[PDB]
């Protein structure tokens, strides 16, 4: 593990095996571990592709590190998904592990798929950032933030959730719906800012196209144009 070193505003990357006489380290307090999000690197956050980023597998035990200070998130995710016959896809969250502290949007993806694998890891190395703990596995029913951790050596001196319904999760033939009513939904055409999904939310309770004891599934196509399925 490499060690970030910073003087004034300069960021050098040493280790200690390269740290020079008098990079004055005088306190354990100058050591910090940071957790930044992939979100702020370009990485899309469209629920479909973000899902496409993770995967399942067994025989490999989950690990956890702890980070001291995080980054405000625009997007986060909450996974309560299962395999067709009840049976949960994901483990429950062991003690101490809580939902990531700061999200503007939480993407509660309820649904179902096949879970070939006991745990679900990240397919690019990234950690799932929970409340000050970074795991290599997604735990059930708990919000998190895709991110990566670094280690520094300093110098001396509200939210909203969005609900989803999904099928064949692990699969390649997956299908994503945006849950607005107990009986109404909308098809996710990937490119969909959360602000926009919340504007659909507003334009549905306003317009009036939320079904009545018979379940409907509309499809927007871009004041705009919403169709229906069958």
């Amino acid at each position, epitope marked *: 593990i490499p060690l970030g070193v910073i003087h004034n505003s300069t960021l050098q990357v040493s280790d200690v095996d390269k740290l020079v006489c008098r990079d004055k380290l005088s306190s354990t307090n100058q050591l910090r571990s940071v957790g930044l999000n992939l979100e702020g690197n370009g990485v899309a956050t469209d629920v479909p592709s973000a899902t496409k980023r993770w995967g399942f597998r067994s025989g490999v035990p989950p690990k956890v590190v702890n980070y001291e200070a995080g980054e405000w998130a625009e997007n986060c995710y909450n996974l309560e998904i299962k395999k*067709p016959d009840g049976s949960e896809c994901l483990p429950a969250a062991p003690d101490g592990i809580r939902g990531f502290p700061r999200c503007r949007y939480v993407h509660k993806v309820s649904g179902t798929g096949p879970c070939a694998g006991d745990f679900a890891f990240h397919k690019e190395g990234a950690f799932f950032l929970y409340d000050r703990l970074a795991s290599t596995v997604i735990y059930r029913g708990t919000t998190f933030a895709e991110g990566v951790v670094a280690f520094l050596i300093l110098p001396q001196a509200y939210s909203t959730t969005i609900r989803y319904q999904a099928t064949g999760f692990g699969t390649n033939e997956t299908e994503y719906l945006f849950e607005v009513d107990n009986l109404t939904y909308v098809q996710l055409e990937s490119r969909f800012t959360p602000q926009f999904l919340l504007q659909l939310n507003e334009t549905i309770y306003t317009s009036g196209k939320r079904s009545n004891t018979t379940g409907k599934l509309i499809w927007k196509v871009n004041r705009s144009e919403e169709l229906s399925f069958s």
Partner: antibody
Amino acid sequence: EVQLVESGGGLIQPGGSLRLSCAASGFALRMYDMHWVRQTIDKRLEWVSAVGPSGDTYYADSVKGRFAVSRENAKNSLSLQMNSLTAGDTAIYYCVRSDRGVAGLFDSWGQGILVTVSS
Amino acid sequence: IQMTQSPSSLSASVGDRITITCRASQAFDNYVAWYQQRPGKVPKLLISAASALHAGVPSRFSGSGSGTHFTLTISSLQPEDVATYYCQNYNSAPLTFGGGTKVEIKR
């Protein structure tokens, strides 16, 4: 709207074989986990089996090793291969749609088809 | 892991209130569904999440309970309510149904 139509049932000898088929309309199979649930002679309801859109199959232990469930998404159809049958498998069998979202919640039921196993 | 119901049968007049009880062995975060099967007909989903009323069911139907004791109540019993009611654990394994409670009108 949602319609589920079972076929392929009837009377069979024990140790015999039957194939139930279910034709779905009004939604799309890709989107749902599909189940088979049966009502035995004691009018008790009993979950029999399930299959996901990717073909992941599941069975109640009471039929496990004897039954095989499968689906064809493109045909919007599903089937239950019932083998090594016993008198205890005598029941009304229902093709059933589970709520897309959470598993085990049976929101749509077919009309049911009778299977009798006897000599 | 085991659903059992009480009673096996009950009688009440039209307009009366009744209560069906569903006992769970083990607990499972209260994922309990109630189904209605009218005589000679196919079962219909009435209630999920112990208390969430579904499509087309009158508000006289209410559900409650937690842990392992769960209940279904009809506040104004009507003739079309005559049926067998099943509780079922879902979102858990195994998926099992109660033995059913048969509801009749007392006249």
